[PDB]
Amino acid sequence: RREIKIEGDLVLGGLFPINEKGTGTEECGRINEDRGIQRLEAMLFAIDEINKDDYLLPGVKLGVHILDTCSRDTYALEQSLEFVRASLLLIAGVIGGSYSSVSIQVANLLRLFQIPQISYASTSAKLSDKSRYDYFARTVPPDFYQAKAMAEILRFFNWTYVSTVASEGDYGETGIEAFEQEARLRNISIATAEKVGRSNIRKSYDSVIRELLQKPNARVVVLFMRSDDSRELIAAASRANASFTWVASDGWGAQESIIKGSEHVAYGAITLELASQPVRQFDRYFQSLNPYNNHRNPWFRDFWEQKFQCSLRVCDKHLAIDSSNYEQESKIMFVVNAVYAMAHALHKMQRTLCPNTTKLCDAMKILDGKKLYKDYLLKINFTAPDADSIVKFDTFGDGMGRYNVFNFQNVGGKYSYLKVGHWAETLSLDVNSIHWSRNSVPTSE
Amino acid sequence: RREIKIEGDLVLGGLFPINEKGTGTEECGRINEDRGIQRLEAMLFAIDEINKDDYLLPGVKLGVHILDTCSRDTYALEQSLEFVRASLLLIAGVIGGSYSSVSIQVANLLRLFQIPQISYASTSAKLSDKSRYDYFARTVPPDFYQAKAMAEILRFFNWTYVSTVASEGDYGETGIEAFEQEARLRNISIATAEKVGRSNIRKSYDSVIRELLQKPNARVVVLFMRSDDSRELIAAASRANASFTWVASDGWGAQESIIKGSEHVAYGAITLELASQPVRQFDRYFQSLNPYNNHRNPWFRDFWEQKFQCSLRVCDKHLAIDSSNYEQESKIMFVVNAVYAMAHALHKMQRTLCPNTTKLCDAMKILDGKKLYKDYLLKINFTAPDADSIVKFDTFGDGMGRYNVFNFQNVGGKYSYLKVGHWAETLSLDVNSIHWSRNSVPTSE
Numbered sequence: 001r002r003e004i005k006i007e008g009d010l011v012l013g014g015l016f017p018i019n020e021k022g023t024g025t026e027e028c029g030r031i032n033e034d035r036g037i038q039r040l041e042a043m044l045f046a047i048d049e050i051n052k053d054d055y056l057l058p059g060v061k062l063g064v065h066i067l068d069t070c071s072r073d074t075y076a077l078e079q080s081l082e083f084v085r086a087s088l089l090l091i092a093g094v095i096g097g098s099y100s101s102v103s104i105q106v107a108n109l110l111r112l113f114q115i116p117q118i119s120y121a122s123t124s125a126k127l128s129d130k131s132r133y134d135y136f137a138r139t140v141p142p143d144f145y146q147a148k149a150m151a152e153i154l155r156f157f158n159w160t161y162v163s164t165v166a167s168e169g170d171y172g173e174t175g176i177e178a179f180e181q182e183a184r185l186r187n188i189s190i191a192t193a194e195k196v197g198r199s200n201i202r203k204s205y206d207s208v209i210r211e212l213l214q215k216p217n218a219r220v221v222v223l224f225m226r227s228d229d230s231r232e233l234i235a236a237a238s239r240a241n242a243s244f245t246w247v248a249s250d251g252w253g254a255q256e257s258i259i260k261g262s263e264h265v266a267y268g269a270i271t272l273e274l275a276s277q278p279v280r281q282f283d284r285y286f287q288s289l290n291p292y293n294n295h296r297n298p299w300f301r302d303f304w305e306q307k308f309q310c311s312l313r314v315c316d317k318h319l320a321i322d323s324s325n326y327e328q329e330s331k332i333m334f335v336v337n338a339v340y341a342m343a344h345a346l347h348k349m350q351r352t353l354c355p356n357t358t359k360l361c362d363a364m365k366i367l368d369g370k371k372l373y374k375d376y377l378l379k380i381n382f383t384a385p386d387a388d389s390i391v392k393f394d395t396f397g398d399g400m401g402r403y404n405v406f407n408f409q410n411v412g413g414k415y416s417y418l419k420v421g422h423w424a425e426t427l428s429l430d431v432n433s434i435h436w437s438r439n440s441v442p443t444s445e
Numbered sequence: 446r447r448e449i450k451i452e453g454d455l456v457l458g459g460l461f462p463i464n465e466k467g468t469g470t471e472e473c474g475r476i477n478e479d480r481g482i483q484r485l486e487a488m489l490f491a492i493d494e495i496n497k498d499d500y501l502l503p504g505v506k507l508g509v510h511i512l513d514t515c516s517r518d519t520y521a522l523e524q525s526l527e528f529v530r531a532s533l534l535l536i537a538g539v540i541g542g543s544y545s546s547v548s549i550q551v552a553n554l555l556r557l558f559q560i561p562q563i564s565y566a567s568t569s570a571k572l573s574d575k576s577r578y579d580y581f582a583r584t585v586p587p588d589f590y591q592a593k594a595m596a597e598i599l600r601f602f603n604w605t606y607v608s609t610v611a612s613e614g615d616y617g618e619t620g621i622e623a624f625e626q627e628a629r630l631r632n633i634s635i636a637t638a639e640k641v642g643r644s645n646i647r648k649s650y651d652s653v654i655r656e657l658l659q660k661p662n663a664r665v666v667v668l669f670m671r672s673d674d675s676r677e678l679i680a681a682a683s684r685a686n687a688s689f690t691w692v693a694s695d696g697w698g699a700q701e702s703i704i705k706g707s708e709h710v711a712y713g714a715i716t717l718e719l720a721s722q723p724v725r726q727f728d729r730y731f732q733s734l735n736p737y738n739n740h741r742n743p744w745f746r747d748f749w750e751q752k753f754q755c756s757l758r759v760c761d762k763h764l765a766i767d768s769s770n771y772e773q774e775s776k777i778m779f780v781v782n783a784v785y786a787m788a789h790a791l792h793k794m795q796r797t798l799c800p801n802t803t804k805l806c807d808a809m810k811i812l813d814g815k816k817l818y819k820d821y822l823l824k825i826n827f828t829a830p831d832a833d834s835i836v837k838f839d840t841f842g843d844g845m846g847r848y849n850v851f852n853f854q855n856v857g858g859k860y861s862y863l864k865v866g867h868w869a870e871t872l873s874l875d876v877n878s879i880h881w882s883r884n885s886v887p888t889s890e
């Protein structure tokens with residue numbers, strides 16, 4: 001029964017895809033290093049920082065209850081029952097999840113116990129429906145904007161006949177449906193519309209690649225897809241020696257885990273990811289972690305063994321997370337900001353209900369989740385450790401539509417994602433910086 | 446009757462392709478800006494510098510007699526008769542020409558009057574035959590080395606099945622014949638061997654392109670070709686939408702005049718040019734020239750009118766040669782070094798025959814061209830305005846086999862030749878710096 005239980009005056013729930021979905025039958029698979037472990041650690045880091053902050057909840061120690069979702073909504077629901085068992089360890093708010101289907105499933109349960117929820121990565125436009133997700137907010141924007149951003153990229157390059165591939169579920173389907181409307185407003189025609197996934201209703205990854213090849217004019221393929229699904233499509237494209245210009249949503253983003261080993265078939269890909277700035281203090285914190293000093297994370301040993309491909313053959317005692325094997329996951333800023341958003345809402349309620357103490361007074365011992373959400377959580381602060389670096393929610397509990405545009409390249413022997421553009425109400429690109437095809441040495445034999 | 450006659454104690458002849466060959470019938474065509482005018486000016490500059498040098502011929506003023514070859518050996522012979530009329534204005538030595546056929550034709554005449562000749566650009570291995578060209582030397586190497594350098598480039602990239610195109614004449618034919626032997630030593634097979642040129646025996650440029658397309662496996666085409674011929678082949682390749690990886694000799698080199706307007710069909714070309722270092726003092730001298738202060742050059746007005754596409758519509762009085770419209774022609778170092786080689790040989794003869802004067806004594810009034818060539822011209826000095834920056838000739842009157850390797854690219858909107866390698870006995874390359882194909886935005890319509 002793996003979890004992180006750290007005692008406090010107020011406890012925050014945490015949900016992270018520590019492990020991937022398991023193959024065939026198994027619930028849990030490999031460790032998700034950057035979107036699982038780093039994010040988990042970014043929450044532990046933010047809590048440690050808040051617990052050292054003299055201006056944010058002094059006298060009110062924040063504890064945690066962090067669980068694995070195994071990248072499955074069904075597994076997340078089971079785990080989320082632990083957060084509500086105390087109403088059937090009391091929970092003040094929940095941080096997570098990542099996948100929109102997980103956040104949706106969790107929200108369906110949490111709203112029944114008036115528990116506020118803040119996601120740091122779920123971008124489904126569905127989650128903006130406050131009549132259904134009345135206790136949900138997020139430091140990230142809805143995919144209404146990402147879809148617009150992608151249609152504007154195609155319109156800019158006159159990619160007027162494209163194919164679409166979407167992951168089944170809450171993220172992919174509504175994301176691509178929004179993209180199809182934006183594309184239609186820009187006289188962009190859709191050649192074929194495919195859906196991928198693990199369910200009984202989905203066609204094969206090879207059948208999807210065959211559908212893309214049956215429209216040879218559509219060389220640009222727009223993807224709104226999970227990471228796990230992006231890998232299976234790339235593998236299928238490889239098997240059929242299919243060549244496409246992939247234009248992918250944040251599900252792919254600037255993740256090297258999707259392209260590693262199949263760099264040639266994803267060359268020249270254009271990807272989006274939410275506009276973020278790395279938390280420098282997090283880099284320091286994360287690089288100091290090892291299996292000998294990190295006692296509070298029960299998944300850290302499995303993470304270490306996977307990351308360094310050894311057993312603790314044998315793991316060298318001086319293996320270290322550093323700039324040679326690590327880069328801050330693009331959405332860490334949102335994790336820290338979500339924990340801080342919850343803490344700021346709690347601090348404000350604390351100062352309103354207990355003005356003559358720093359402590360959790362009698363008037364605030366029984367938390368009013370409804371008031372915490374509506375009267376406090378929709379607040380305003382400058383990010384923790386330009387001009388618009390403020391943490392706030394709109395009327396619908398959403399973040400701002402800001403994205404960075406990336407191009408998958410080969411710099412000088414090394415494959416990476418280079419930032420080539422930005423989207424915030426309008427599209428800005430550095431067209432000269434983009435590489436569209438692999439620079440292969442010609443053959444003459 | 447266009448020429449440059451500057452009076453001196455000793456006069457040096459000069460031959461430069463000021464104008465291109467004329468089309469159809471006409472002897473002279475457009476002005477050759479960089480290989481014609483700049484080179485001519487590099488000789489006038491070197492003479493001005495020598496005439497200011499207290500350590501090199503003080504007391505012996507160097508004059509000039511500079512003529513246009515119109516890039517034709519037949520025209521060069523006519524002009525060269527002026528240098529020998531004084532034996533049928535006395536000439537001490539001749540600087541030039543550029544094209545190997547011109548230098549050969551000139552040498553056939555000069556050797557009859559014991560007049561030493563130094564070429565700054567003729568690389569034919571034929572000119573190394575001292576039983577035939579007994580008065581010829583050069584600051585440049587024979588193409589025995591360039592051919593080796595090119596075969597080593599192909600061998601390095603495993604380009605084992607290639608086509609060849611050569612300009613008819615002394616440069617192309619012996620250059621490619623040497624390449625074919627070096628390629629055969631490296632198990633490189635030749636698909637087709639074509640020859641181009643203005644003569645009655647040559648097949649069409651379109652017929653040559655058709656021969657290259659009939660061997661589709663041979664994507665790499667090696668060229669030993671004149672500049673004028675390189676342009677006609679590129680135009681023919683364009684008309685047939687032919688795509689090839691061109692590997693070209695110094696005839697093409699790093700000249701933008703060959704690719705201007707047809708950058709797309711020559712993209713990713715690998716070219717060689719003799720290893721040279723720009724003469725900084727020349728840049729200053731050349732950029733100061735305008736049609737109002739340059740009285741001694743009778744072709745400068747035509748040059749200016751062509752370079753700026755105006756009539757002196759109307760040429761702006763403040764038009765200037767600068768870093769925005771000018772780059773020192775790759776072989777300027779060799780022009781300056783050839784003039785200096787002649788001056789050093791004359792200085793040494795002067796100090797041997799007139800030890801008690803700086804002046805041209807009675808003992809040196811009738812120059813012994815045979816002794817000047819054999820006993821003095823094969824000398825040794827550090828270049829004028831690493832460790833091996835010395836000016837010398839081997840036993841055969843030749844320079845050292847050193848080449849720079851260039852790649853025709855699009856940097857960031859601008860098309861240019863980037864140095865990507867070097868050859869001096871062995872091949873060294875920076876493979877990561879090379880671009881092989883045009884980075885075109887994909888089409889999806």
Ligand SMILES: N[C@@]1(C(=O)O)CC[C@H]2[C@H](C(=O)O)[C@H]21
Nearest residue numbers: 098099100121122123171251
């Ligand atoms: N924006 C996503 C979503 O399901 O809403 C797409 C896939 C997964 C991304 C993540 O964890 O960074 C989250």
Ligand SMILES: N[C@@]1(C(=O)O)CC[C@H]2[C@H](C(=O)O)[C@H]21
Nearest residue numbers: 543544545566567568616696
């Ligand atoms: N090396 C050449 C030659 O005919 O020997 C080839 C074409 C022409 C080059 C030049 O003027 O720079 C000279």
